[PDB]
Paper text:
Helicase loading at DNA replication origins depends on the Origin Recognition Complex (ORC), Cdc6, and Cdt1 (3–7). Here, we report two cryo-electron microscopy (cryo-EM) structures that capture helicase loader–helicase complexes just prior to DNA insertion.
Three-dimensional classification of the OCCM–ΔC6 dataset enabled us to identify a 4.3-Å average resolution structure of the semi-attached OCCM. In the semi-attached OCCM, we observed the entire C-terminal domain of Orc6, which was making contacts with the origin DNA. In the semi-attached OCCM complex, DNA near the narrow C-terminal tier of the helicase loader is in a bent conformation, and is held in place by Orc6.
Author numbering:
A (entry chain C): 138 to 159, 180 to 274
B (entry chain 7): 740 to 791
C (entry chain A): 404 to 434, 448 to 499, 507 to 555, 560 to 659, 677 to 730, 769 to 907
D (entry chain D): 46 to 158, 171 to 190, 207 to 426, 447 to 529
E (entry chain E): 2 to 299, 319 to 353, 372 to 395, 412 to 476
Write the structure that this text describes.
């Protein structure tokens, strides 16, 4: 859903945040107060493992939720789209209003075990 | 025109309290008033829905 | 217990005890019984044997609500305090979760509070180990049967132990309850006593009224003419016409045979004469009186008569415009359930099939724009979401949920003939 | 002048009814209904009656406005004499409402001069023993949407309070407010026998003259505050006495469609605050042209102004979208069926004459706004669930329509083809395509 | 009485929001609806009011950065005691736990606990709560919106501080469910083609004359001392043309114009000359190539192998080929538009063995590429994605459109258009 994709992901960074830090709520409340909750700033990265099996409207509604975090200026977001193939399939599935959100600084790096042998 | 006529029946029900099916002495107090024999004939059948 | 000391306050500024106030004090539903006289013994002689012999039995009574089965078994145990037991009112509907009754029993043996799991362990440990006395009322048994019958098997398996100091008394809604909800393995444990309670009869319904009207029927009050206060300047009396009390009985015994319904229709009819007496003289709130037959004629009808007919003729125009379109489709198709877009299709069509009558034109001007020839050309009519929402929460209409606002079906909820009939006005 | 602005202070709080409780004004078409409510409520506290009632009437019908009016009418003279407990059926479920009662009980005790502590059924038998049991405190219950408590499954909370009528020495009174009309059949047998059966229906504006009489009592100020007042009062009725006056004309429209006063009461609030001097306000109620602009704005984007505010292509896609929709029996149509017939429509325009026919990869960006402008719907899509746990059962359900691609989600129609001809003007070139 | 601001195209709507909002609570109506679609600046025109009114106090909440109502109650109760700390710092406080609340009773339980210590204030002060985006909450239903309407009346009405609401939502089908509550609504209309361009020019002059991509191109070309007005003209000539060559593609949006500008702007900058600064019409004629293409799409020859390629080409056959016809026309002796039908297993290998160049019999690698194609989501299960292996009742289906099939047919030299016959 939109819900547990948020909630598990906030949980997964939070234990990663306490382990480097040496009660709270698992949503975007931590994201703004991360400057005060943990001192230093935040640069998270999103290893979307198998991206074409997900219902894309959930993914499209997910990225609009991340769009609201762009007004705090102490956090940096980075998305990694590990597709299997077929980039043209992916620009078909999403909402076109979010592709224009995506198309700011895209980089189509190829990673293939078989690349020119 | 029918709210009063239940109470003259209640004046009989004051007297003996009888729920008889066919009438010869209930109708006797009706003809001196001004209503016909047909209006009370409907009043027999419709007050059967009141189970009285 | 504790806070009833705090529920008392001091300043009580001389409330006017009028004529009909002292009626409603005894017409309160609180304070030997005439109707279920011998069946009180049939419970009690079934109960007196097991009590004075240290056994474990079961007693099953049924009947419609309003017949005294809440009352009678309280009168059983009440005299028994004069002559070894712990009384508990284990109500079914007063338990939030069905397992919560288990907590009460283990609370009401020593005073401990554990879970429903840990209670019934020690309850079972009680019911087969104690050397040798517990009365328990399992009221309103429709509540505690619902989930998987695992609770109900326990409450009768405890009865089977010969070393179980317990006396259970079940009071249900129907005699059918261990035959259409329970299993046969419970139905062996329920026994075959099965004391049936019928309704009340209309003769006894007279005999229950005057028990409340014992010291007050045709008695005398002492009244000052200035405030309307009555004391058990004139010395007035108040009489109750017994024939009107009789016609109260011959209806309530006919339909329901309910002891609350008989008292309350007398209680409702009592206050009709209260306001009419206050209307004629105005004593506020700071020769021979009676209660007519015409009071209980209204108040009994006041249980029956509706207003949805009067509600419909007092609705808006577009409300009555809506239903008249809706019956037109139901006699066009005969399918009693029409698509929402077809109704919007019809109310368009029901404009121009009528002529160029200027009333319809003054309607048709207003029906698509609130005057204001600037803004016009509305597709669906003005406030069409509003009246359809107003007909929905009123309960007259019913509309299934769909995000399409065209093919969502609509179903009537009241009888369509009375909808046809109220439309005629 | 501030005296004109002081008149704005008086007139506004008169339109909200936020006056002190001596001068709150009840309209004439319901004065009888509050008095029988008053005869119920004041003999419940003073004369210690223990009887219940159900208020029934449609939404926005002063029902919650009537009851606290009585309380404020009794708060002035009977201060400590009673406490009120108010429960909404909306805000309270079946089980937290027990905690709703007990917590609202104890805060009254400090106002009148260990309860909420324990389990939910532990505090439940507590308030059972505290209620069932110089003078006694009486308790007034205020229930909003009591029909939702009257569900099918348990109905516990109704069964306890109605038995508190029968046995408790503490004098209570219950006030059910709802809008489901036949409330009595919604109850089962064993609860209705506890019920004292007395319901009271709420009145409606039965004649055109009634709300005309209401709005006169609504707008007229009787207390002397401003020098403008005597001038202001006769301007009001002079508009109201004339049946050909525009304010009297537009009130007739409100009697027709809505027949509900707070709808019209809503309209006047900007109309009397938009004026800046005294004379402009009198012209405003003389002209009532602002009501036209107001009813314009309330209408401006439900369905028609949605259609007027689209470009040339967005019309042309949707116009093609209905001409496909007329062909099939259910009316459903895919995206490929749309763009195919959209192609030959543009080809017909050039061959009968210079119009940029767009590609495939771009119509999707226009197709995105059209579905979220609700001009189309998905074929089998229940839009909004009624309550929370029915919506939560729809969230876990993985769907099949997303698993077929974007261009094959079988979109159906919200606005039918024949109705497009009536709204689209003939000056537009696609007017020949509205009709088939 | 209030100090209204002034904006571009909300001249009616600034008046009503100045009408329906006062610092006095009695004149202030309880609940309010600001309605309009995205692309009207309602979050713009609301805050633009609030900056012009420092007398009132606003607490700004954001539902779209939340996910559910259970944190949304925790969102409210954390903020009011956060705000009232910063409004009356002399008032002592038993600070409560905002984590504690999770149920709609608990809010009014805690607001009964919050406001009572603030009773000693001097005048009835209001306090405006603002919810932004109430329709796009991702767990909404029917019985949530009314649940927040009656929250005011469960509060004690005689407290010195009164909480009132303003609701921002969209999708006006949703508002038609609640018109019978008759709460005062201020609808926000959509825009017209001029006022889109009129809004856009006064909002994008502040960046597109100050971008370094201009400022590089200033000093890179022979810079004549062109004025900021000369920079203003070419910026205005850019905006007045970009909305003209794209309005049919975008509708009356503002967000979808705010980014297409920021894609085509530096590509417009490179095609200017020193001389075309005075020559705007010929400048468009030299920079023409971007104004007729979208440039939002950042057709693959697919990666999969040869036997998997014929595995795809047999799966597309049962979008039209029914079992009544296929075994006759494929002997060893139109729904191109329509949605695809449902497979079963071994009907693939029925068609696969026929159309392959006795030359093949081993089917281990053929079974390999099936669940390879299942991970590519090009052929998916009808049911849930779990038990599809063991042959219970499982139906299969393609999810690839016709064109990618058509290229992949010729990519393996196989002819497919013969066997599709209406
Ligand atoms: N024979 C009677 N004599 C005197 N009072 C009676 C008699 N029968 C009923 N009542 C009164 O009427 C009330 C009706 O309650 P009951 O009939 O005892 O309850 P009920 O029959 O179990 O209906 P329930 O509890 O909903 S199943 C009693 O509480 C008494 O106050
Ligand atoms: N605090 C208040 N003071 C005075 N009038 C109020 C107040 N709150 C609401 N109203 C009025 O209440 C009327 C709406 O009717 P209500 O009874 O509040 O709603 P209802 O639909 O009749 O019943 P509810 O509220 O839906 S359960 C409007 O005329 C409001 O002006
Ligand atoms: N009158 C105006 N003057 C200047 N800029 C305006 C005006 N109206 C709208 N805008 C701009 O329009 C932009 C749109 O902002 P938003 O409020 O997000 O639009 P929206 O319709 O509210 O969509 P949302 O955010 O989903 S509610 C604002 O950021 C402003 O820059």
């Amino acid at each position: 859903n939109v819900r547990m994709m948020l909630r598990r992901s906030m949980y997964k960074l939070y234990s990663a945040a306490d382990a480097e830090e040496h009660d709270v709520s698992y949503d975007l409340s931590l994201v703004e107060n991360f400057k005060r909750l943990f001192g230093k700033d935040l640069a998270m990265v999103f290893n979307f493992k198998d991206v074409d099996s997900i219902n894309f409207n959930t993914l499209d509604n997910f990225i609009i939720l991340l769009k609201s975090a762009f007004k705090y200026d102490h956090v940096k977001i980075s998305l990694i789209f590990n597709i299997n193939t077929n980039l043209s399939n992916i620009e078909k599935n999403l909402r076109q209003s979010t592709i224009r959100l995506l198309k700011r600084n895209y980089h189509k790096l190829d990673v293939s075990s078989n690349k020119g042998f | 025109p029918t709210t009063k006529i239940f109470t003259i029946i209640k004046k009989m029900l004051q007297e003996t309290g009888k729920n008889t099916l066919s009438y010869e002495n209930i109708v006797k107090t009706v003809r001196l008033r001004g209503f016909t024999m047909l209006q009370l004939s409907n009043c027999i059948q419709e007050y059967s829905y009141l189970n009285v | 217990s504790r806070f009833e000391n705090k529920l008392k306050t001091t300043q009580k500024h001389q409330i006017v005890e009028t004529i009909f106030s002292k009626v409603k004090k005894q017409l309160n539903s609180s304070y030997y019984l005439p109707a279920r006289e011998n069946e009180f013994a049939s419970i009690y002689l079934s109960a007196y044997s097991a009590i004075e012999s240290d056994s474990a039995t079961t007693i099953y009574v049924a009947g419609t609500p309003g017949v005294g089965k809440t009352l009678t078994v309280r009168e059983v145990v009440k005299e028994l305090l004069s002559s070894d037991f712990l009384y508990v009112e284990i109500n079914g509907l007063k338990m939030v979760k069905p397992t919560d009754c288990y907590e009460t029993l283990w609370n009401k043996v020593s005073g401990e509070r554990l879970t429903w799991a840990a209670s019934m362990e020690s309850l079972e440990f009680y019911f087969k180990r104690v050397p040798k006395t517990i009365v328990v009322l399992l009221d309103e048994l429709d509540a505690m049967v619902t989930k998987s019958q695992d609770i109900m098997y326990n409450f009768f398996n405890w009865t089977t132990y010969e070393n179980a100091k317990l006396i259970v008394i079940a009071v249900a809604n129907t005699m059918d309850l261990p035959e259409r909800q329970l299993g046969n393995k419970i139905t062996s444990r329920i026994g075959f006593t099965r004391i049936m309670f019928t309704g009340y009869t209309h003769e006894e319904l007279k005999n229950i009224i005057d028990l409340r009207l014992k010291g007050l029927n045709d008695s005398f009050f002492y009244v000052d003419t200035k405030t309307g206060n009555a004391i058990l300047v004139r010395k007035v009396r108040l009489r109750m016409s017994a024939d009107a009390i009789e016609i109260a009985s011959r209806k309530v015994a006919s339909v329901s045979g309910d002891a609350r319904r008989a008292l309350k229709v007398c209680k409702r009819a009592a206050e009709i004469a209260e306001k009419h007496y206050m209307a004629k003289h105005g004593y506020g709130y700071d020769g021979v009186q009676t209660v007519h037959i015409t009071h209980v004629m209204k108040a009994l009808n006041e249980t029956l008569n509706s207003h949805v007919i009067t509600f419909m003729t007092r609705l808006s125009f577009t409300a009555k415009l809506f239903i008249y379109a809706l019956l037109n489709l139901m006699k066009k198709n005969g399918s009693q359930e029409q698509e929402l877009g077809d109704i919007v299709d019809e109310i368009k069509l029901l404009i121009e099939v009528n002529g160029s009558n200027k009333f319809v034109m003054e309607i048709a001007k207003t029906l698509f724009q609130q005057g204001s020839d600037n803004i016009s050309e509305q597709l669906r009519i003005i406030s069409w979401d509003f009246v359809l929402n107003q007909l929905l929460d009123a309960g007259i209409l019913f509309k299934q949920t769909m995000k399409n606002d065209r093919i969502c079906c609509v179903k009537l909820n009241i009888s369509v003939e009375e909808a046809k009939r109220a439309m005629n006005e | 002048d501030p005296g004109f602005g002081s008149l704005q202070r008086r007139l506004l709080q008169q339109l909200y009814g936020t006056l002190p409780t001596d001068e709150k004004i009840i309209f004439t078409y319901l004065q009888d209904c509050q008095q029988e409510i008053d005869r119920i409520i004041k003999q419940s506290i003073i004369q210690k009656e223990s009887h219940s009632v159900i208020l029934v009437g449609p939404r926005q019908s002063y029902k919650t406005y009537l009851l606290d009016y009585e309380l404020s009418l009794l708060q002035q003279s009977y201060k400590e004499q009673f406490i009120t407990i108010r429960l909404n059926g909306f805000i309270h479920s079946e089980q937290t409402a027990i905690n709703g009662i007990a917590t609202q009980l104890e805060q009254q005790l400090q106002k009148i001069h260990t309860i909420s502590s324990g389990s939910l059924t532990e505090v439940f038998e507590k308030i059972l023993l505290l209620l069932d049991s110089i003078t006694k405190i009486t308790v007034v219950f205020i229930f909003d949407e009591i029909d939702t408590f009257a569900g099918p499954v348990r109905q516990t909370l109704l069964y306890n309070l109605f038995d508190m009528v029968e046995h408790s020495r503490v004098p209570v009174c219950i006030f059910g407010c709802t809008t489901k009309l036949n409330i009595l059949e919604y109850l089962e047998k064993r609860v209705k026998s506890r019920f004292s059966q007395r319901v009271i229906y709420m009145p409606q504006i039965q004649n055109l003259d009634d709300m005309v009489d209401a709005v006169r009592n609504l707008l007229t100020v009787r207390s002397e505050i401003s020098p403008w007042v005597s001038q202001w009062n006769e301007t009001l009725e002079k508009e109201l006495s004339d049946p050909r006056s525009n304010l009297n004309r537009h009130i007739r429209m409100n009697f027709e469609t809505f027949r509900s006063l707070p709808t019209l009461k809503n309209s006047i609030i900007p109309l009397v605050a938009t004026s800046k001097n005294f004379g402009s306000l009198c012209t405003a109620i003389k002209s009532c042209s602002f009501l036209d602009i107001y009813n314009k704005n309330q209408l401006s984007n439900n369905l028609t102004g949605r259609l007027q505010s689209l470009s040339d292509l967005e019309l042309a896609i949707l116009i093609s979208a209905a001409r496909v929709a007329l062909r099939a029996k259910d009316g459903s149509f895919n995206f490929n069926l749309a763009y195919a017939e959209y192609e030959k429509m543009i080809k017909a325009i050039n061959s009968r004459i210079t119009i940029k026919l767009w590609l495939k990869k771009d119509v999707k960006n226009v197709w995105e706004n059209l579905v979220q402008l609700d001009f189309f719907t998905e074929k089998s899509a229940v839009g909004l669930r009624d309550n929370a746990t029915a919506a939560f059962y729809a969230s876990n359900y993985q769907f099949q329509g997303t698993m077929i691609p974007f261009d094959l989600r079988s979109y159906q129609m919200q606005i039918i083809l024949q109705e497009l001809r009536r709204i689209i003007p003939k000056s537009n070139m696609y007017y020949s395509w509205t009709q088939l | 009485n209030v100090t209204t601001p002034e904006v571009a195209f909300r001249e009616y709507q600034t008046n009503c929001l100045a009408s329906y909002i006062s610092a006095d609570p009695d004149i202030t109506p309880s609940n309010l609806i600001l309605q309009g679609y995205s692309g009207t600046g309602k979050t713009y025109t609301l805050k633009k009011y609030f900056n012009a009114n420092p007398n009132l106090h606003a607490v700004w909440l954001e539902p779209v950065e939340l996910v559910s109502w259970k944190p949304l109650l925790q969102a409210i109760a954390r903020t009011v005691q956060y705000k009232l700390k910063t409004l009356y710092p002399n008032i002592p406080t038993t600070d409560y736990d905002p984590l504690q609340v999770e149920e709609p009773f608990l809010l009014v339980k805690t607001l009964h606990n919050i406001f009572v210590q603030y009773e000693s204030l001097q005048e009835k002060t209001c306090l405006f709560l603002i919810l932004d985006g109430f329709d796009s909450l991702q767990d909404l239903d029917a019985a949530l919106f009314n649940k927040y309407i009656k929250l005011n009346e469960l509060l004690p009405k005689d407290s010195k501080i009164n909480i009132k609401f303003i609701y921002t939502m969209l999708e006006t089908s949703f508002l038609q469910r609640y018109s019978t509550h008759c709460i005062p609504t201020v609808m926000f209309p959509r825009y017209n083609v001029d006022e889109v361009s009129t809004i856009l020019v006064m909002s994008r002059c502040g960046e597109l004359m100050e971008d370094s991509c201009l400022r590089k191109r200033i000093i890179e070309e022979q810079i004549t001392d062109c004025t900021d007005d000369q920079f203003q003209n070419v910026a205005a000539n850019f905006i007045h043309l970009i909305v003209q060559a794209f309005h049919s593609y975008t509708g009356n949006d503002i967000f979808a114009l705010n980014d297409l500008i920021d894609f085509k702007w530096p590509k417009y900058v490179s095609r200017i000359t020193k001389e075309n600064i005075f020559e705007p019409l010929a400048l468009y004629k030299s920079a023409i190539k971007l104004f007729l293409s979208t440039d939002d799409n950042l057709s693959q020859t697919y990666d999969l192998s040869i036997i998997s390629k014929y595995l795809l080409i047999a799966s597309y056959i049962c979008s039209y080929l029914e079992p009544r016809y296929d075994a006759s026309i494929f002997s060893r002796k139109n729904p191109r538009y329509l949605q695809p039908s449902l497979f079963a297993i071994e009907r693939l290998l029925a068609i696969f063995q026929a159309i392959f160049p006795s030359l093949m019999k081993a089917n281990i690698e053929v079974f390999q590429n099936l669940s390879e194609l299942h991970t590519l989501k090009l052929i998916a299960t009808t049911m849930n994605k779990n038990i599809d292996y063991l042959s219970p009742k499982v139906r299969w289906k393609v999810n690839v459109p016709w064109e990618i099939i058509k290229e992949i047919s010729e990519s393996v030299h196989f002819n497919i258009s013969d066997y599709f016959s209406d």
